[PDB]
A paper describes a structure:
TNF, like most members of the TNF superfamily (TNFSF) exists mainly as a trimer with a threefold symmetry resulting in three identical receptor binding sites. The mechanism by which TNF induces signalling across the membrane is poorly understood, however, it is generally believed that the process involves receptor clustering. There are currently five approved TNF biologics that work by completely blocking the interaction of TNF with its receptors but to date, there are no small molecule therapeutics available that disrupt the high-affinity TNF–TNFR interaction. Small molecule inhibitors of TNF are described that stabilise a distorted TNF trimer, reducing the affinity of TNFR1 at one binding site and effectively reducing the stoichiometry of receptor binding from three to two per TNF trimer.
Recently, we described small molecule inhibitors of TNF that stabilised a distorted conformation of human TNF (hTNF) by binding in a pocket within the trimer core. Each of the compounds bound hTNF in a similar mode within the trimer core, resulting in an equivalent degree of distortion in the trimer. In order to strengthen the correlation between structural observations made with the mTNF(UCB-4433)–TNFR1 complex and how they are likely to also apply to hTNF, a comparison of the binding mode of UCB-4433 in human and mouse TNF was made.
Author numbering:
A (entry chain B): 7 to 70, 73 to 101, 112 to 157
B (entry chain A): 5 to 102, 105 to 107, 111 to 157
C (entry chain C): 9 to 30, 35 to 86, 89 to 101, 112 to 144, 147 to 157
The structure:
C-alpha cells in the first residue's frame, strides 16, 4: 500500500532568469497526497508535523559587499502573516561556492502556505541537477 | 485525521527577547516539543533510547573587524544519567576576521549528527559569544532532535 | 517497523576512499558495491552528511563536492548535490536530504570528489527510510 503521507520535492528552474521558481514537472520531483504548488508556494493539505527543507547553491567569480540570504517562510491561513521558519545569511567575500541547506520539524495547519526564497537569484548555480530544491514530508 | 507519529521530536529556537544570551524556547511561535521531549534548564531531555538526529544552527554577525582576534564556537553536548558530566558530541570554531581605520560579516554555524541516545540524556547547544548572536529575525537560531 | 531502512557510516580506517559500513540495514536494504539497494517501490527520505578538514590552503584551488545519485534498475542521475570552496586548519561539512519516488532495484550512491580531505564522529553517514 503506497504511502499516503503528504510530500513534495520541487526543483528550481535553471532558465528562469532573476527568479527562484519551483517546478514539480521534472525528473525526480514530486507533489503527492494533496500538496499543491500555487504561486510558487507549497500548500499544506492537512494539519500535522512536517519535515520542511530546502537547499540553494550560490556561486561567484571572485569578489567585488555580497550578502546571500535563503529563507523558508510560513503563511498561516488563520493569522494571515508571513514569518520566517528557517533562515541563513552568508557573506562570502577564483570561483567560490556557497551551499545553504535548511531543515527542521514544524507543526503546520491545513491551508498553510510555505515559500522558499533568496535575495540574489543572479548568484544561483545550476551546473548539475539536485543543487536547488525545496520540500516537505508529513511525519 | 491520520495517526500522528509517536517519535520524539523537538525544534526549539533562540529567545529573541534575551539579548546577550542564548535561551532556548518551545513556548514561541513555530517551536515545538512532542512525544515526551522536554526543555528543562535550557537543555533538551530525551524520553527514550534510540538513534536521533541532533541539529543546531546559530548565526553570528559583526560590523567590521576588532583589534582583539574573534573566535566563534558552537557546541552540542550530552549529559547522560550514567555519567553526569558534559561530553561534546559536535563542535565547530570559526574566525570571522582574517580592518584599517566596516562591512558587516555573517558567520552561520550548523552542527548535525546521528547519535545513539539514552533515556534521560540532557542535550545542550551553546556558544561562546552571545554578544555576536544575530536574532534580527526569526528562523536563524535553532536546536532540534528527531528520533529515527 | 516493517519499513526498509538504512543508516551506514564511513570507515575511519580506510585509505583515501569513502567506504560505507553497516549503523542499520533492515527490512531488505542492502549495502552492495558501496551503494544502497532499494528492496521495494515507493517514497524514501534519503539523507547524508560528509565532513572535510584541511591544514591551511594550497596553490591548487580545492573544490569539495558531495553527491547522492540514483542508479536505475532499468544510468546515473544526481538527486542531491552540493559544492564548497573552503579557501590554519579549516573544517567544512556538506549535508543533504530529501524525499524521492524510487523503484525496486534502484541503487543509491553517496560520493565525494576529494576523500583525501575527509575528517573522522557521528557526522559522516548515509541513509534512507521508506515512508
Ligand atoms: C543532513 C541530514 N542528516 C539526516 C539524518 C537523519 C534524518 C532523518 C530525518 C527524519 C527521519 N525520520 C524517520 C524516523 N522518524 C522521523 C522521520 N529519519 C532521518 C535527516 C537528515 N538530514 C536532512 C535533514 C535535516 C533536518 C531536517 C530534515 C532533513 O531531511 C529531510 F527534510 F530531507
Amino acid at each position: 500500500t503506497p504511502s499516503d503521507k503528504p510530500v513534495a520535492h520541487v526543483v528550481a528552474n535553471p532558465q528562469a532568469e532573476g527568479q527562484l521558481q519551483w517546478l514539480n514537472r521534472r525528473a525526480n520531483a514530486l507533489l503527492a497526497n494533496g500538496v499543491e504548488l500555487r504561486d510558487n508556494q507549497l500548500v499544506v493539505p492537512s494539519e500535522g508535523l512536517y519535515l520542511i527543507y530546502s537547499q540553494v547553491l550560490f556561486k561567484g567569480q571572485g569578489c567585488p559587499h555580497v550578502l546571500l540570504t535563503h529563507t523558508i517562510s510560513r503563511i498561516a491561513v488563520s493569522y494571515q502573516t508571513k514569518v520566517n521558519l528557517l533562515s541563513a545569511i552568508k557573506s562570502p567575500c577564483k570561483p567560490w561556492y556557497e551551499p545553504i541547506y535548511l531543515g527542521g520539524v514544524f507543526q503546520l495547519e491545513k491551508g498553510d502556505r510555505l515559500s522558499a526564497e533568496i535575495n540574489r537569484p543572479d548568484y544561483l548555480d545550476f551546473a548539475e541537477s539536485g543543487q536547488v530544491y525545496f520540500g516537505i514530508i508529513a511525519l
